[PDB]
Amino acid sequence: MSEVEPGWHYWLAYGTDVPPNQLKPEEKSVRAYPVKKHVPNLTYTDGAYVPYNTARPKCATWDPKVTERP
Amino acid sequence: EESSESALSKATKWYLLSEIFRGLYITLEMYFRAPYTIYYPFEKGPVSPRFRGEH
Numbered sequence: 766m767s768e769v770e771p772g773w774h775y776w777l778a779y780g781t782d783v784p785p786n787q788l789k790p791e792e793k794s795v796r797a798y799p800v801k802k803h804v805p806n807l808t809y810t811d812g813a814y815v816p817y818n819t820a821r822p823k824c825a826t827w828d829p830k831v832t833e834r835p
Numbered sequence: 836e837e838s839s840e841s842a843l844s845k846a847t848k849w850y851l852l853s854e855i856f857r858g859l860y861i862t863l864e865m866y867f868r869a870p871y872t873i874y875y876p877f878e879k880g881p882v883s884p885r886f887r888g889e890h
């Protein structure tokens with residue numbers, strides 16, 4: 766069921782009367798980035814999303830340097 | 836002594852299972868009706884614009 770494109774996923778569920786191929790140009794979404802082929806749910810594969818922390822560590826340890834006495 | 840039904844009428848219903856045979860008949864009416872089942876994932880139940888799902 767994740768193979769159904771999001772535009773048509775709404776029409777299929779009787780949520781809208783206008784199919785996403787009959788949309789008014791003043792109702793289509795405007796995307797400033799290239800849109801690729803639909804990607805289904807990737808679980809049980811190698812494409813499953815992996816969470817990670819998007820923030821750097823909050824303390825920066827000293828960068829040690831040695832100075833020699835006179 | 837104040838039961839309106841005669842003895843035979845009360846016993847004909849009792850021995851011949853009057854309400855049970857009716858109960859079967861009402862259930863058999865449903866057998867010739869359109870079922871409700873939808874064939875998910877080829878069909879989806881109704882959704883509304885207010886629906887809450889994935890973020």
Ligand SMILES: CCCCCCCCCCCC(=O)OC[C@H](COP(=O)(O)OCC[N+](C)(C)C)OC(=O)CCCCCCCCCCC
Pocket residue numbers: 847848849851852853854856857859860
């Ligand atoms: C003929 C062979 C098939 C049926 C065999 C069984 C007979 C049952 C009825 C006799 C017992 C009795 O008590 O009958 C009398 C009862 C109750 O009458 P009441 O409530 O006083 O009526 C109220 C007052 N009126 C008389 C003015 C209406 O009627 C019934 O409930 C009838 C049930 C009919 C539907 C069930 C039959 C279909 C089953 C499946 C068949 C394939």
Ligand SMILES: CCCCCCCCCCCC(=O)OC[C@H](COP(=O)(O)OCC[N+](C)(C)C)OC(=O)CCCCCCCCCCC
Pocket residue numbers: 849850851852855
């Ligand atoms: C002379 C003609 C002979 C006819 C023979 C047929 C007799 C059949 C039984 C009648 C007596 C009766 O239904 O009895 C009811 C009994 C006991 O009832 P009780 O404890 O005495 O209370 C009620 C009586 N009172 C208040 C007077 C004391 O329990 C039941 O509900 C049994 C229900 C069984 C239903 C099973 C499903 C049927 C499948 C077949 C159809 C598809």
